[PDB]
Amino acid sequence: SHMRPEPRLITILFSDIVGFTRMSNALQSQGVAELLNEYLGEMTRAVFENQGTVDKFVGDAIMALYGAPEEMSPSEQVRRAIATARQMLVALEKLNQGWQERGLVGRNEVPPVRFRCGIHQGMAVVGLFGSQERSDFTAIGPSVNIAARLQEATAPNSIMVSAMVAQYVPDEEIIKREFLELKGIDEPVMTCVINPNM
Amino acid sequence: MRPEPRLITILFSDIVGFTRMSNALQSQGVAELLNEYLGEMTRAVFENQGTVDKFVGDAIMALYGAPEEMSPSEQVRRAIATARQMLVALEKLNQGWQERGLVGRPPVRFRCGIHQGMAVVGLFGSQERSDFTAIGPSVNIAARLQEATAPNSIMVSAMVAQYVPDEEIIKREFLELKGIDEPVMTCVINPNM
Numbered sequence: 001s002h003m004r005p006e007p008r009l010i011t012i013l014f015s016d017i018v019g020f021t022r023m024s025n026a027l028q029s030q031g032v033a034e035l036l037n038e039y040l041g042e043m044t045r046a047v048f049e050n051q052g053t054v055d056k057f058v059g060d061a062i063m064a065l066y067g068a069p070e071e072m073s074p075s076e077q078v079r080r081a082i083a084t085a086r087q088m089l090v091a092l093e094k095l096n097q098g099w100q101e102r103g104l105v106g107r108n109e110v111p112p113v114r115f116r117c118g119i120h121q122g123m124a125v126v127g128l129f130g131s132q133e134r135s136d137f138t139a140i141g142p143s144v145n146i147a148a149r150l151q152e153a154t155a156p157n158s159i160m161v162s163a164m165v166a167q168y169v170p171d172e173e174i175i176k177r178e179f180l181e182l183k184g185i186d187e188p189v190m191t192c193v194i195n196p197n198m
Numbered sequence: 199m200r201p202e203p204r205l206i207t208i209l210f211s212d213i214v215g216f217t218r219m220s221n222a223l224q225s226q227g228v229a230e231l232l233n234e235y236l237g238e239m240t241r242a243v244f245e246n247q248g249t250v251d252k253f254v255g256d257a258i259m260a261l262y263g264a265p266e267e268m269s270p271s272e273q274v275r276r277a278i279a280t281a282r283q284m285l286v287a288l289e290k291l292n293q294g295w296q297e298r299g300l301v302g303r304p305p306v307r308f309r310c311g312i313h314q315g316m317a318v319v320g321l322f323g324s325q326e327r328s329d330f331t332a333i334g335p336s337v338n339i340a341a342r343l344q345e346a347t348a349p350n351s352i353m354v355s356a357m358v359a360q361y362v363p364d365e366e367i368i369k370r371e372f373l374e375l376k377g378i379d380e381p382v383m384t385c386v387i388n389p390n391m
């Protein structure tokens with residue numbers, strides 16, 4: 001027995017390392033693999049400490065859900081998604097320092113690691129998909145695509161969110177408001193780059 | 199499996215315009231179609247000794263040459279066989295869906311990309327939640343090839359085509375693959391022998 005996935009208001013945080021490919025070539029398998037595992041370990045810790053749920057890892061990208069499976073208020077979803085994003089950036093510093101003092105970065109034209117983060121709140125079909133084995137709890141829908149594309153539209157080490165997220169964010173933490181057209185998304189989105197600090 | 203360097207073949211499948219038919223299937227239709235589709239597709243990969251890495255919406259990632267070793271030529275054969283069987287199964291799925299109201303009221307079609315190359319294969323993530331997957335440019339290439347090919351067609355890189363019988367190559371064209379600075383040699387293969 002299972003539960004039919006259904007529409008639920010959730011918040012999605014999409015993080016993605018900037019140009020991982022280029023360093024996956026500069027560094028070596030063992031280096032790449034270890035840098036990734038440390039990165040993924042720290043980032044997920046951040047998500048977990050903020051009551052978030054790591055939906056999955058898609059390479060060097062992370063998809064975190066807030067409001068599923070555990071219920072969570074709209075404002076709370078956002079507060080935690082942002083706290084998570086801001087906490088990931090602080091952990092990125094320590095990681096780089098460490099990857100620096102090891103040669104994984106800051107040497108051999110391998111710039112220190114940077115990532116993009118997008119946060120969006122909207123409706124999405126959430127639940128178990130696939131088949132009674134390779135079945136997994138995930139979110140399906142346009143809302144998800146918007147988060148991923150906001151991420152690809154923001155500068156390195158910056159956090160971009162949609163208007164639906166910014167409404168719970170203080171004005172003083174808003175760096176820039178923009179009206180962008182995201183790929184695969186017909187209607188333009190009102191976005192805001194938020195301060196990586198509170 | 200410990201993250202190690204390895205030559206593998208990556209198969210990337212994706213349904214065309216799944217969203218465009220979302221608010222028509224409703225949450226219930228999306229679920230049933232996706233579940234049925236995923237089941238069959240995963241079967242195709244299974245019957246061909248492939249390893250299902252993960253689903254990403256209506257997209258599927260399969261690996262050949264890991265965890266179990268497999269020769270370069272074998273990888274391509276199994277991968278191409280999987281892709282072809284996928285279309286066949288797609289016929290039947292569409293049939294059933296057809297005489298059901300779900301689709302054809304457009305019918306489901308998908309793209310498939312295939313690339314062979316080095317990649318770090320093994321368990322990544324955390325010492326809580328980790329998953330068997332592949333890392334490296336090769337995955338991007340497979341997915342990008344998947345996005346550039348026409349619906350219900352299989353597109354591969356030159357590294358894969360080098361094992362395919364020439365007569366089965368429907369088209370050779372240099373295309374732009376996002377993330378790849380230089381245009382790549384793409385090969386559309388016959389969906390049949």
Ligand SMILES: Nc1ncnc2c1ncn2[C@@H]1O[C@H](COP(=O)(O)CP(=O)(O)OP(=O)(O)O)[C@@H](O)[C@H]1O
Pocket residue numbers: 016017018019020021022024058059060152259331332333334335336337338339377
């Ligand atoms: N298991 C997996 N599933 C999907 N992609 C994977 C993967 N493992 C590794 N990848 C890889 O992760 C990399 C993503 O490419 P990047 O160099 O980081 C581009 P980017 O800087 O994020 O720019 P962009 O997102 O604006 O396009 C590719 O090398 C891709 O092949």
Ligand SMILES: Nc1ncnc2c1ncn2[C@@H]1O[C@H](COP(=O)(O)CP(=O)(O)OP(=O)(O)O)[C@@H](O)[C@H]1O
Pocket residue numbers: 063138139140141142143144145146184212213214215216217218253254255256345
């Ligand atoms: N777990 C997940 N992670 C990321 N995206 C997900 C997802 N689950 C579902 N999706 C969604 O799955 C849908 C797939 O989009 P499609 O309309 O089929 C694009 P397409 O027709 O394949 O064109 P394209 O691949 O050439 O860009 C979107 O609604 C996307 O947001």
Ligand SMILES: C[C@]12CC[C@@H]3c4cc(O)c(O)cc4CC[C@H]3[C@@H]1CC[C@@H]2O
Pocket residue numbers: 016058059060061145148149152184254255
């Ligand atoms: C194609 C997609 C938008 C880009 C999303 C992405 C972007 C990115 O820059 C990454 O490094 C990784 C991902 C993984 C999921 C992708 C999504 C699947 C449905 C949607 O149409």
Ligand SMILES: C[C@]12CC[C@@H]3c4cc(O)c(O)cc4CC[C@H]3[C@@H]1CC[C@@H]2O
Pocket residue numbers: 058059212254255256257337338341342345377
């Ligand atoms: C951004 C990406 C290429 C597109 C790949 C994709 C495409 C698509 O059309 C889908 O429906 C789903 C996916 C999931 C993984 C994506 C890959 C992650 C690394 C690489 O840079």
Ligand SMILES: [Ca+2]
Pocket residue numbers: 016017018019020021060061
């Ligand atoms: Ca990346």
Ligand SMILES: [Ca+2]
Pocket residue numbers: 212213214215216256257
């Ligand atoms: Ca799709």
Ligand SMILES: [Mg+2]
Pocket residue numbers: 016061
């Ligand atoms: Mg990316």
Ligand SMILES: [Mg+2]
Pocket residue numbers: 212257
């Ligand atoms: Mg797609």
